[PDB]
């Protein structure tokens, strides 16, 4: 609803960038003095196609209506005359993503489980608003402070139709396949349970402290190999069908690993929902906190 004026926007640094999306840090200072607020601005590349342009408007509209303690705060929008679209203005989460934070800061198991609990609370809220995230990964989880985490990029987020239990995707080259459930890779159908599979992968990332050598693409590519022509996805689909999974991270308790494996049930309906996960993680965090 809010309109940011381009004349008070001052670019500080780039924060992240993909194939069609880009996030940069700006100071919004309508006094040219001190009081200036720090904002994260997402822009769509002017070269993006009509599917990405219509999907960009869908993204702004999803975030314009979402409001939760564990979801990034929508600030407003400013015109991007340079791209003939809009720029998405969000609050700046200063400690950044868990992907950049965890390899640099030794975080105890207790705090990691609190983050996992917070991720599920934000995801359950998203699912109650009938939206699927489709890109749940540690790179998309933002650290506000030592005890606050927020879900941050809604670039693939979709509305689940009223009469359906899933959304049909039709796969692209930018799909985060190493965080995807077998039904996504094989049938191109994204269920609410498909986001729970991705959370399982996120939970694995958190427990490995986002170590690159232990990351899902590294680990799965060690199992598949790199001389597979166009068949990486097919080889991943069959290893998952054989019941092969990411290993137990060093120092991850057995029960937390069992919960991870429960999120990785081949059969989507055998997975817990985010609402089911919230009291389980509440109790597992209470345990390890003491």
Binding positions for ligand 2YK, rule: CB under 6 A: 15-16, 18, 21-23, 40, 42, 72, 90, 92-93, 96-97, 140, 142, 152-153
- Residue 21 assigned to a binding site: yes
Q: Which residues of 137-150 are buried (b: 16+ CB within 10 A; e: fewer)?
A: bbbbbbbbeeeebb
Q: How far is the CB of 150 from ligand 2YK (least distance, A)?
A: 8
Q: Which one of 14, 29, 33, 135 is the catalytic residue?
A: 135
Does residue 135 carry a catalytic annotation?
yes
What is the distance between the terminal CA atoms of the chain, rounded to a whole angstrom? 44
Q: Which residues of 187-220 are buried (b: 16+ CB within 10 A; e: fewer)?
A: eebbbbbbbbbbbbbbbbbbbbbbeeebbbeebb
Q: How far is the CB of 95 from ligand 2YK (least distance, A)?
A: 9
Counted residue by residue, the chain has a size of 290
Answer whether 23's CB lies under 8 Å from 42's CB.
yes
Q: How far is the CB of 55 from ligand 2YK (least distance, A)?
A: 13
- Nearer Cβ to ligand 2YK, position 18 or 49? 18
Residues 6+ apart with CB under 8 A from 153: 21, 23, 135, 139, 140
- Residue 34 assigned to a binding site: no
- Residue 11 assigned to a binding site: no
- Nearer Cβ to ligand 2YK, position 86 or 109? 86
Return the biggest CA–CA distance within the chain: 61
- Nearer Cβ to ligand 2YK, position 21 or 182? 21
Among the listed residues 104, 121, 110, 122, the one whose alpha carbon sits nearest the alpha carbon of residue 147:
110
- Residue 156 assigned to a binding site: no
- Nearer Cβ to ligand 2YK, position 90 or 284? 90
Q: How far is the CB of 34 from ligand 2YK (least distance, A)?
A: 21
In the complex, which residue's CB is closest to ligand 2YK?
Answer: 16
- Residue 190 assigned to a binding site: no
Answer whether 202's CB lies under 8 Å from 119's CB.
yes
Detail the residues annotated as belonging to a binding site for ATP: 15-23, 42
Detail the residues annotated as belonging to a binding site: 15-23, 42
Give catalytic residues, as residue numbers.
135
């Amino acid at each position: 609803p809010t309109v940011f004026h381009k004349r008070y926007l001052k670019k500080i640094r780039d924060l992240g960038e993909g194939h069609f999306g880009k996030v940069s840090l700006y100071c919004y200072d309508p006094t040219n003095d001190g009081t200036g607020e720090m904002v994260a601005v997402k822009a769509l590349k002017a070269d993006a196609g009509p599917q990405h342009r219509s999907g960009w408007k869908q993204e702004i509209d999803i975030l314009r209506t979402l409001y939760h303690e564990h979801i990034i705060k929508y600030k407003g929008c400013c015109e991007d005359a340079g791209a003939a679209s809009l720029q998405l203005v969000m609050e700046y989460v200063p400690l950044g993503s868990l992907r950049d934070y965890l390899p640099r800061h030794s975080i105890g198991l207790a705090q990691l489980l609190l983050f996992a609990q917070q991720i599920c609370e934000g995801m359950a809220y998203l699912h109650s608003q009938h939206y699927i995230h489709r890109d749940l990964a540690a790179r998309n989880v933002l650290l506000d402070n030592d005890r606050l985490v927020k879900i941050g990029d809604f670039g693939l987020a979709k509305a689940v139709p009223e009469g359906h239990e899933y959304y049909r995707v039709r796969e692209d080259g930018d799909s985060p396949v190493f965080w995807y459930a077998p039904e996504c890779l094989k049938e191109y159908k994204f269920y609410y349970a498909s986001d729970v599979w991705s959370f399982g992968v996120t939970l694995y990332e958190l427990l490995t402290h986002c170590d690159s050598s232990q990351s899902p693409p590294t680990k799965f590519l060690e199992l598949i190999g790199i001389a597979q022509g166009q068949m990486t996805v097919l080889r991943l689909t069959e290893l998952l069908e054989r019941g092969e999974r990411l290993p137990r991270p060093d120092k991850c308790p057995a029960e937390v690993y069992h919960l991870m494996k429960n999120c990785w049930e081949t059969e989507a309906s055998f997975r817990p929902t985010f609402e089911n996960l919230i009291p389980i993680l509440k109790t597992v965090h209470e345990k390890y906190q003491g």
